[PDB]
Amino acid sequence: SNLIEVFVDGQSVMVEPGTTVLQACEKVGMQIPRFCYHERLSVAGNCRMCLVEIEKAPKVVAACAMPVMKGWNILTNSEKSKKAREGVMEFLLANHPLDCPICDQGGECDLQDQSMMFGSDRSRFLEGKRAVEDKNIGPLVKTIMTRCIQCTRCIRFASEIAGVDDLGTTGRGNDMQVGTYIEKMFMSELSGNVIDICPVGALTSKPYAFTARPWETRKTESIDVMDAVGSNIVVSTRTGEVMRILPRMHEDINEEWISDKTRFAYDGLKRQRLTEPMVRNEKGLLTYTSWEDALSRVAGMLQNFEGNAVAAIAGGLVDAEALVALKDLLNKVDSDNLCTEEIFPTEGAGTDLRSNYLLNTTIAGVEEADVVLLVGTNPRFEAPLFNARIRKSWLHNDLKVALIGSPVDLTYRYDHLGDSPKILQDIASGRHSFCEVLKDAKKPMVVLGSSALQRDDGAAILVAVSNMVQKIRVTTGVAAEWKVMNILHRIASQVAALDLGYKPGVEAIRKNPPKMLFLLGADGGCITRQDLPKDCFIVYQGHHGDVGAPMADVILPGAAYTEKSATYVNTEGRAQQTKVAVTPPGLAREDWKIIRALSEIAGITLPYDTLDQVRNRLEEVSPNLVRYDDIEETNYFQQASELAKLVNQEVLADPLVPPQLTIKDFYMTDSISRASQTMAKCVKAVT
Amino acid sequence: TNMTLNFGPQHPAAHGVLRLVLELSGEMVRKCDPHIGLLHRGTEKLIEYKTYLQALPYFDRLDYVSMMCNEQAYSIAVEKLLNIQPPPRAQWIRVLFGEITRILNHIMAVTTHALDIGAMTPFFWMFEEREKMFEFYERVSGARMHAAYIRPGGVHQDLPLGLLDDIYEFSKNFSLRIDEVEEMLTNNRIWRNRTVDIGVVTAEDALNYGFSGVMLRGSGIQWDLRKTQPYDVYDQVEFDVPIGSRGDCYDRYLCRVEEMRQSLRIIEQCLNKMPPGEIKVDDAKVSPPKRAEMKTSMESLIHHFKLYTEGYQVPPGATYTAIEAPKGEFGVYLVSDGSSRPYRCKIKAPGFAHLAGLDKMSKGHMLADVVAIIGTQDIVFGEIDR
Amino acid sequence: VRPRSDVTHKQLSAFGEYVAEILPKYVQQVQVSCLDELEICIHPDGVIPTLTFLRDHTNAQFKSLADLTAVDVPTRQNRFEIVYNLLSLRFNSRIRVKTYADELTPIDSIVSVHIAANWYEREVWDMFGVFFFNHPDLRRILTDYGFEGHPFRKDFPLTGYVELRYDDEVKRVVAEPVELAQEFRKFDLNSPWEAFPA
Amino acid sequence: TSVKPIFSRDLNEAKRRVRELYRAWYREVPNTVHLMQLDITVKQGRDKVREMFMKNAHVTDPRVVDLLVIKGKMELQETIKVWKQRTHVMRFFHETETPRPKDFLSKFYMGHDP
Amino acid sequence: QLITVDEKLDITTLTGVPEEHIKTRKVRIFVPARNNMQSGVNNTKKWKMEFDTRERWENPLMGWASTADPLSNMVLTFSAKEDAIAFAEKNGWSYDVEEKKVPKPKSKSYGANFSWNK
Amino acid sequence: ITHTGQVYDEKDYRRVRFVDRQKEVNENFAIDLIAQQPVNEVEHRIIACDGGGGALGHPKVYINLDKETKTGTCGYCGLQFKQ
Numbered sequence A: 001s002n003l004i005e006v007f008v009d010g011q012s013v014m015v016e017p018g019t020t021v022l023q024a025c026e027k028v029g030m031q032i033p034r035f036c037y038h039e040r041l042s043v044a045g046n047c048r049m050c051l052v053e054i055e056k057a058p059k060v061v062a063a064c065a066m067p068v069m070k071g072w073n074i075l076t077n078s079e080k081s082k083k084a085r086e087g088v089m090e091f092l093l094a095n096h097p098l099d100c101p102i103c104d105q106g107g108e109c110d111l112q113d114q115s116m117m118f119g120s121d122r123s124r125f126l127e128g129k130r131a132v133e134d135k136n137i138g139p140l141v142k143t144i145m146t147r148c149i150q151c152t153r154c155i156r157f158a159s160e161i162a163g164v165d166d167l168g169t170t171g172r173g174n175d176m177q178v179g180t181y182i183e184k185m186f187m188s189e190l191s192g193n194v195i196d197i198c199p200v201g202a203l204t205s206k207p208y209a210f211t212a213r214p215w216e217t218r219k220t221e222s223i224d225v226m227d228a229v230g231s232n233i234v235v236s237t238r239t240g241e242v243m244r245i246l247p248r249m250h251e252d253i254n255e256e257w258i259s260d261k262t263r264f265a266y267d268g269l270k271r272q273r274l275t276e277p278m279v280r281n282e283k284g285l286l287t288y289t290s291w292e293d294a295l296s297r298v299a300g301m302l303q304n305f306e307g308n309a310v311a312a313i314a315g316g317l318v319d320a321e322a323l324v325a326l327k328d329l330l331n332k333v334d335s336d337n338l339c340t341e342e343i344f345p346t347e348g349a350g351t352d353l354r355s356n357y358l359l360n361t362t363i364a365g366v367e368e369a370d371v372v373l374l375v376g377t378n379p380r381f382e383a384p385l386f387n388a389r390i391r392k393s394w395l396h397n398d399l400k401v402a403l404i405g406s407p408v409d410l411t412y413r414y415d416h417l418g419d420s421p422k423i424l425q426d427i428a429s430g431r432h433s434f435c436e437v438l439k440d441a442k443k444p445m446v447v448l449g450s451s452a453l454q455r456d457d458g459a460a461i462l463v464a465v466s467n468m469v470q471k472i473r474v475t476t477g478v479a480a481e482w483k484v485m486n487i488l489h490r491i492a493s494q495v496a497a498l499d500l501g502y503k504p505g506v507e508a509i510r511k512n513p514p515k516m517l518f519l520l521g522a523d524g525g526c527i528t529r530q531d532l533p534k535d536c537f538i539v540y541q542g543h544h545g546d547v548g549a550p551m552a553d554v555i556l557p558g559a560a561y562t563e564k565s566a567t568y569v570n571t572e573g574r575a576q577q578t579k580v581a582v583t584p585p586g587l588a589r590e591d592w593k594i595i596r597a598l599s600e601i602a603g604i605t606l607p608y609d610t611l612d613q614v615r616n617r618l619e620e621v622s623p624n625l626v627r628y629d630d631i632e633e634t635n636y637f638q639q640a641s642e643l644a645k646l647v648n649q650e651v652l653a654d655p656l657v658p659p660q661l662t663i664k665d666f667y668m669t670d671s672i673s674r675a676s677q678t679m680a681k682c683v684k685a686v687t
Numbered sequence B: 001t002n003m004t005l006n007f008g009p010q011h012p013a014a015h016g017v018l019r020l021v022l023e024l025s026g027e028m029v030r031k032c033d034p035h036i037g038l039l040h041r042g043t044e045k046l047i048e049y050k051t052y053l054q055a056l057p058y059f060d061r062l063d064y065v066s067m068m069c070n071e072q073a074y075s076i077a078v079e080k081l082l083n084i085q086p087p088p089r090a091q092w093i094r095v096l097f098g099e100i101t102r103i104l105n106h107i108m109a110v111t112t113h114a115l116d117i118g119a120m121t122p123f124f125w126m127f128e129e130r131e132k133m134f135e136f137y138e139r140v141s142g143a144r145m146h147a148a149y150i151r152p153g154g155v156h157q158d159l160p161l162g163l164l165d166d167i168y169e170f171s172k173n174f175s176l177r178i179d180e181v182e183e184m185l186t187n188n189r190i191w192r193n194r195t196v197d198i199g200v201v202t203a204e205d206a207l208n209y210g211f212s213g214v215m216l217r218g219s220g221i222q223w224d225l226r227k228t229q230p231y232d233v234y235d236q237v238e239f240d241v242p243i244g245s246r247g248d249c250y251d252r253y254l255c256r257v258e259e260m261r262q263s264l265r266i267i268e269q270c271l272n273k274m275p276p277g278e279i280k281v282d283d284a285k286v287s288p289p290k291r292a293e294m295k296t297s298m299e300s301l302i303h304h305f306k307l308y309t310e311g312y313q314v315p316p317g318a319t320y321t322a323i324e325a326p327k328g329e330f331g332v333y334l335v336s337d338g339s340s341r342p343y344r345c346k347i348k349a350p351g352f353a354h355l356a357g358l359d360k361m362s363k364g365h366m367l368a369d370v371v372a373i374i375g376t377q378d379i380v381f382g383e384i385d386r
Numbered sequence C: 001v002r003p004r005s006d007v008t009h010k011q012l013s014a015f016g017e018y019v020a021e022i023l024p025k026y027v028q029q030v031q032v033s034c035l036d037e038l039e040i041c042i043h044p045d046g047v048i049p050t051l052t053f054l055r056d057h058t059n060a061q062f063k064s065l066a067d068l069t070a071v072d073v074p075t076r077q078n079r080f081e082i083v084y085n086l087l088s089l090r091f092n093s094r095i096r097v098k099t100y101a102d103e104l105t106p107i108d109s110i111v112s113v114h115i116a117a118n119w120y121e122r123e124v125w126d127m128f129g130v131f132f133f134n135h136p137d138l139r140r141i142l143t144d145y146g147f148e149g150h151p152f153r154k155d156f157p158l159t160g161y162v163e164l165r166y167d168d169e170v171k172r173v174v175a176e177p178v179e180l181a182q183e184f185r186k187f188d189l190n191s192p193w194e195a196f197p198a
Numbered sequence D: 001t002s003v004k005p006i007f008s009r010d011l012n013e014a015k016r017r018v019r020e021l022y023r024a025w026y027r028e029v030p031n032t033v034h035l036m037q038l039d040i041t042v043k044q045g046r047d048k049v050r051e052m053f054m055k056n057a058h059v060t061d062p063r064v065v066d067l068l069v070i071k072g073k074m075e076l077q078e079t080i081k082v083w084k085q086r087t088h089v090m091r092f093f094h095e096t097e098t099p100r101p102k103d104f105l106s107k108f109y110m111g112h113d114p
Numbered sequence E: 001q002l003i004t005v006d007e008k009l010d011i012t013t014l015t016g017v018p019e020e021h022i023k024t025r026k027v028r029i030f031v032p033a034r035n036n037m038q039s040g041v042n043n044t045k046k047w048k049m050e051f052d053t054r055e056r057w058e059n060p061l062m063g064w065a066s067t068a069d070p071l072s073n074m075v076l077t078f079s080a081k082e083d084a085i086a087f088a089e090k091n092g093w094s095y096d097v098e099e100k101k102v103p104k105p106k107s108k109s110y111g112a113n114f115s116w117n118k
Numbered sequence F: 001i002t003h004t005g006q007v008y009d010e011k012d013y014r015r016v017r018f019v020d021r022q023k024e025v026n027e028n029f030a031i032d033l034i035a036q037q038p039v040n041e042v043e044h045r046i047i048a049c050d051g052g053g054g055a056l057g058h059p060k061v062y063i064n065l066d067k068e069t070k071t072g073t074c075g076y077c078g079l080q081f082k083q
């Protein structure tokens, strides 16, 4: 049923009714040469470079457009469909400016290839060419738009994938130029994708203007650590320094798109970077010294100090492998004061059941939802490729989005229930209007952002939301595998840390001050040296000198996610593996080894000595860490609620506000981001 | 060990580098086990990592006495895989420089043979003629040797305006220069002795050990791949293969002097009948676009950029194409995936087979005989070692 | 367009069946390629028998061995693809007989059928590691005397693992693990767009 | 499974061949150290032979062992026949190269990738 | 007659690889993704197994990148996942296969976006 | 010193090289040479730029000197054209 049989050159493929002629060729395996057709962008038919010839038909048809009908054999390599490409390519090239040795989409051109495979050996355009006027679309995208083949994929993406709706066509004839009518910069996250989506090199990346050329770039597939969506990405490295980071497709997490932060902050990765292990000198300044000396500075203090006098404030981009090597070390001197900077409420079941702290409705479950209750977070600037998810599911499907936060730019039409944590109680009572809207929802989903939890009444906010999820679930009678409650994070090493049993919040360190603290990539201000005991002996374990370095008795440089085979996990627990794109710089070493080595100098040696062994260690403390690309299906929401019901807390009237109110808030957050000259240029452009 | 004595790598007598571990009862050779690979350099593996056009320079280096004739074999092979054939003028060129190259190889083989024998004046006489020929190469390609002129789709650039005339003056005279060598060696009362009846190879044995060259032709087997399986336009010319009888070092020599003579007959024709036309295929797909065109037409720049950066993208297949390089049958077995860079390129070297025969040729022979036989095989260690 | 002569394509095809019938036992596939060549593919056990028939048959005399080579398709279970290219001086033609050999499953040697193969078989062992039974003297030909590893295997690094320099302390040439001063830049060249097969 | 034999039908028969080669090398070590004027001790060399013959002690498959001696025998021929000049033989001893420590702490202190 | 061996073909002893690069080298079998730059999918067809990346220190005299790892530039191409896994087992290199992820079917129709309703 | 100001430094371990042997640097740096080039005034909205000499120049490109606000600069010659 619903399976027409169409022949692609007599191959009798069978396709659902409503599949385009181009799609029919794909399942046989043939590729229609195409421009202006992108899988996740609307069909436009602008280029008509895809003209094919259905058999027994007078004219050739537009592949991307004609819904294939019953028994129409497509002839993709006929004598006609080649004159329908040999003659289109004649036109695209005719008005094209031949500056291919300027166009940094040199080998990354879908227009030279198709010319070089399906087009014509020579040109007949003896007439003159046209020229358009380069304008400014911002500090990230260089629009040398005299290159544009008017394929309108930008105008689509800028409207359909991102809700900018700014880029547009202006004029008619051969001087239709697809640029902003007034010069207003294209400022939005998801902005850099235009580069990747314009097959022509008209608008390309300005930082990566002319640093390389694609054949040279060695491409290593790794994971996004800047944000907690854990978007898949490919790090393009030449002769050992990263040159670009561009998206690689993951259906569920980032489907071909990556954030503006995690593709222009590769520059931040190359400066202010720690490399040699400095130690505090008698004079009082950090002096570069060999590992042996720096490690025993730390080891000697560690042997002297007992449990609860040694603490670790990890946080930010540290991998799961270091996080278990730091816990195994501090327990071998019996302090379990290991903690993370982002406070996740842990008075009821927290960290114990693995659903209190996960977006368990999958990133791909936003597509099959019905009503989303965004509470206290700006997804646009905390998980940009999850904001897109709710963008697509509000457009192609029909999600009814509701926000209980600050009224904020969300790239879609949301319902602003209010800016008050207590109105969460209003819906639980059934008093507020939306209460029925959910009642009407067969598959609803609440999403509590981590930043709402970071306030003082965060424990109360989680409990209040869990009560509402409980009766939302009861009133809707939603099926068990549909999961209403989920919470999204904004720190890469938070789900992994909570997974390994790290207890969130520095509240424990606050009540009893540790003689020694091993900051593990922590650039947050959660504890300061004035706050620390008189000794204030703390040793920074990280990659960039930002806030923790200048207040550090020891500097043990580490690596970054471009420089180690570590593991990370995003918000719905999908563990993922970063691969080493570039060897770590200077004497700097992998985070897990520094801690295995410090343990050997200390004498409480950790068991693993190779990374497969540390992966085996992760397996004993937690399951997700070893199985990659695998979301954990079952969760135990019912017992979580019981403990939530026991917890009694007051939600203060102060409105819950996301810290990233507008996009300048977004550009600089983590260490690598802060160290970005490109991000800095972006910040001043906004200001 | 019957006084085993390495002929030694450093020996003026041993062209290039040849350790011939020989056990000699006094001055008689009992067994010759040639050692090879003193010049293995990886030419076959390196090519797999290079594109078709950037592997063309390797072929000139495989056997560089015969610089171009080797290039024609890869050319032909890559043209077959693409089912493209060079333009008419290019074909004649390749036969023009194909033959000039044969002379160059024979002047090398006959004169270097004599230097090891002990006659030194023929080498200086003909190296001056060689020199003059190199200059043709240079004024056509840019390099005296290692030109890279014959590319997979024709030659690279048309002949300079005036070369043909000079490849005439030279040809018009070279004969006398071959004649002189003759008055010095063909009938020397002494050349004959050291060469006659040394290294006789039967006809059946020559085919069996895969000799395939003058070495076969010298034994009386009639086989010139240029007449049996014509390549380029060697079909339109008329030449006589110099077959030999009583095959021995002297007879084959006479054959090499005779092909020097016959090549002048082929060169003459090529000068007399070379057509007006283009020297490279017009498919920008295979041949790079003319520089005026790539600097004024977009399709030509795109084709220039892709061709130089990525490559031909030969259709998947495999072919063994053999020409008649001056030494003998030079063949390239070029397996190719659809990629722009080859998958395998075994170079059949007329020379791997010939050396092997050294054992079956130099039996019960004196130390001096071994020196004469290495000469009558024109061993260039580049082709053998590849 | 090359000047194909169908006259050939047919005659060689006809011989391909001829051989296939004459030796049903070892011939697995016989095909005439478009270049117009012919390749009879034989089970490794048919190395001796198929060659001998071609060297000594009145209607197919294939006296000289042009070449013996071994492509290495790592994906293929039987890694190596020994290819023997043979020439008929009489009937004027060439046929290629190609077999498959894995790393530790040796092929028979044809030095008996053609002594030309004495050297090429040593060349295939040195570069690819296939072994040839009944070979008179199989030993490395092209590689260094102490070389470890078979070089033309697709799984062998181009630069290799050892390089040589003269050390004064020991006054003798000495291997050291390869340390290269500009690694081979591995340009990726394949284009993501195919060419519609004619 | 189901694999055609190369020289022996079983590890047992194969081991016979290894014994022979060991003997061969054992008897040869002294000669080489003298015909190549190598600056090594016969005893020392003979231990090296043992080293190599055991470096591959783990092999359980008969076919792999058979090739190993074929290769081993070939090496013998070369050495016995002076084809391999000292430089070639001494390489076995890895005399010039600086030994690398395998201790984790050692590697940590020196190389980015251990 | 054939003989029986249950031993996983391991031929690490014949390949001729230095001990360090057989026990410390992890190779990943993966199908290459597509540079988002181009929309062609002809480079996302065959599986490839690639050895782990190693040191690339700058050269003091000219600043060229320098590498001490021989198996770095080597990427072997295998048609199917099963065959690539076999190569790792007999050569003795450790392997961590990544499942191919192919684009999910997506429903598209020019008429659908013309819907003012939605 | 040089174009991109290469300055092996007073503390570098490479400046050792020039000892007793000079460094290769360039006078008439190009960075300033086109800046020294006069702005080619034109009448037409768009203009070509063969680089001068056709085949002996650069792939011809047409520059849009349409805004006096900006003198078009052929990406190949760095020549500014004044509408």
Ligand code: SF4
Pocket (backbone or CB within 6 Å): A096, A097, A098, A099, A100, A101, A103, A104, A105, A106, A109, A110, A111, A112, A147, A199, A200, A201, A202, B302
């Ligand atoms: S886009 Fe850039 S690269 Fe592709 S053709 Fe036009 S100029 Fe050459």
Ligand code: SF4
Pocket (backbone or CB within 6 Å): A147, A148, A149, A150, A151, A152, A153, A154, A155, A178, A197, A198, A199, A200, A202, A203
């Ligand atoms: S800019 Fe790139 S995408 Fe937007 S239209 Fe011109 S070409 Fe198509």
Ligand code: FES
Pocket (backbone or CB within 6 Å): A033, A034, A035, A036, A037, A044, A045, A046, A047, A048, A049, A050, A051, A062, A063, A064, A065
């Ligand atoms: S690809 Fe056919 S319409 Fe653009």
Ligand SMILES: [Zn+2]
Pocket (backbone or CB within 6 Å): F049, F050, F051, F058, F074, F075, F076, F077, F078, F079
């Ligand atoms: Zn210019």
